[PDB]
Design a protein around this ligand. Structure first.
Ligand SMILES: [Ca+2]
Ligand SMILES: [Ca+2]
Ligand SMILES: [Ca+2]
Ligand SMILES: [Cl-]
Ligand SMILES: [Cl-]
Ligand SMILES: [Zn+2]
Ligand SMILES: [Zn+2]
Lengths: 21, 29, 29, 21, 21, 29, 28, 21, 27, 21, 29, 21
């Protein structure tokens, strides 16, 4: 999940766009 | 779960800004 | 589109808060 | 859509819960 | 206070409503 | 410290939505 | 009015920073 | 009323301070 | 007036995420 | 300024990147 | 560290509120 | 800098004002 990946380590914006619909 | 909740609030703002008109799925657990 | 963008930013925060664990899907027009 | 319903008039917490997953 | 009760453990929306005026 | 200062910032925002017309009073004490 | 509702949301955030430990009572 | 005064015009810090405890 | 001030608050938040390590200017 | 450019009309992510350090 | 990242997000909000029309130049450094 | 000073201990508004332009 996004919480597991991005709440202990910083996620870049291009990493976050992978979760877009 | 306090840190998870605070982290999730900013991720939602970040997903809204990045995805834009595409939208995004959110599911904590 | 400025007002809708500002409103949408507050909607996703409210959806994150009021919905908590069920999650939500946000999409513009 | 949630935009057309809650961005011109105030929606309560109960109206917004309809868009939950 | 609300900090010592909701920043050490997660508070629900019902528990937060206790502090409304 | 910093962690609880950030947590309180989200707390008052949550209280604003939940309480609505009734309002609220915030005290870190 | 949503714009007034959104302004209130930012007002309490500003009240939180300025007031500090004295606190505040958002009446509206 | 803080909404009527500060959502129709910009309120400085001193005007905002008057609503503290 | 008020609307510009509210929009500016979201601008800096957007600048913080986009710019990252580079930082940003707000004038 | 950025306010006159991006608060009267929506600016893209790339346009915001113009103001980075 | 995510907590440092989240803390900086609140710093720029406070800087915007305090500096106002004078502006500011944010740098993580 | 700003992060190393105001993210390990809280900073007042007056301390933050010194970082204005
Ligand atoms: Ca917020
Ligand atoms: Ca905020
Ligand atoms: Ca925000
Ligand atoms: Cl936070
Ligand atoms: Cl807004
Ligand atoms: Zn935060
Ligand atoms: Zn806003």
């Amino acid at each position: 999940g996004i919480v597991e990946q991005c709440c202990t380590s910083i996620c870049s914006l291009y990493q976050l766009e992978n979760y877009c619909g | 779960f306090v840190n998870q909740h605070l982290c999730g609030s900013h991720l939602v703002e970040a997903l809204y800004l990045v995805c834009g008109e595409r939208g995004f799925f959110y599911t904590p657990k």
